[PDB]
Symmetry: C4
Subunit: 92 residues, 4 copies
């Protein structure tokens, strides 16, 4: 439960560092600094406008942006699901 | 199960009171009164257009709005998940 | 499991009948006929653009539209969750 | 768990082949090639803008497009839920 939250924080920070470098110059409102990137990757994790709002516009400059975002989604969404179930199971 | 629904209603009302005060003047369509706020925070909880539709436009006036909305999402979505599982288990 | 799918079909049809009558005249693209309504209520159940795309525009003509849509969401989303878990539990 | 991931990959590929043929000519940005189709069907599976962004605009050319997309959603979202629970249980 604690290790799951620790793995998610580390992965979320590493990805936000990676995103700032990759799309920061071309998409500064979404990835211009670490803070902007952490906020965008939280939104992407909630699946809110991830494709129409973020990744499709990013792919028009970086055609392989999906190699970062789709595995990011698949990982964080599974980890969050594993985390929330983990708290509920430990409570019972 | 009942206490979970009670905790969620209290938290949802407190947050709706907080939102009306914070962004009611600058965003009156989404937070102009308690009723408008309760409706918006229900939408934010369902994750529908929370960032592109609500929080990014709010952050252009209030840059720290994320300190209210991200913890609100993390709390209510976990509580709802705990509530729905609670009914199914019982 | 079967009764859950039966309850969901009945509720989904009743709601689609209710919506066609309520918002069909003022929002004919989303609720103009039973077929259009069933499609919109399926979208509303998946939570896709339910508020920005459907219910906020509907509330500008019908201010109490939320009395129909919010309880519809709370019911169908809980029933679907109960249905999907029901199949998985019965399979094991 | 492995067979669930195998069933999902096969179904996802078959559907992406089907979509390219069906709406590739009329919607080339979303279904112009197998790669574009696989990306769109992943988005549709996450429920992101599936109706307002994809299926409503597709239905204005192909009125029965819902016969492909609604069953696609019902299948893949159930399979993914079955997959994620499968890993956690194991
Ligand atoms: C796990 C999820 C963590 C979410 C953290 C988001 C932090 C984002 C943030 O702090 N800002 C960017 C919001 O786009 C605002 C600052 O840039 C602003 O306060 C300076 O001004
Ligand atoms: C725990 C979930 C709680 C959800 C509660 C939703 C409350 C809906 C708020 C509401 O009543 N209105 C605002 C809709 O934005 C409409 C009124 O303001 C209008 O009918 C009279 O004026
Ligand atoms: C449970 C979910 C059931 C979903 C059923 C959707 C049916 C919608 C539908 O059939 N149409 C409206 C789509 O907006 C298309 C017809 O109106 C068209 O084929 C006639 O032309
Ligand atoms: C089971 C989940 C499977 C998800 C698979 C996503 C596939 C992404 C498709 C893709 O590669 N592109 C289309 C993006 O729309 C980009 C290329 O077309 C481009 O790099 C070369 O041209
Ligand atoms: Na959305
Ligand atoms: Na969504
Ligand atoms: Na969702
Ligand atoms: Na959206």
């Amino acid at each position: 439960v604690g290790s799951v939250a620790a793995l998610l924080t580390v992965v979320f920070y590493i990805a936000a560092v990676m995103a700032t470098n990759l799309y920061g110059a071309t998409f500064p409102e979404w990835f211009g600094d670490l803070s902007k990137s952490l906020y965008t990757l939280f939104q992407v994790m909630t699946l809110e406008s991830w494709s129409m709002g973020i990744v499709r516009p990013v792919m028009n400059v970086h055609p392989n942006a999906w190699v970062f975002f789709i595995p990011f989604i698949m990982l964080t969404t599974f980890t969050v699901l594993n985390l929330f179930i983990g708290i509920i199971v430990d409570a019972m």
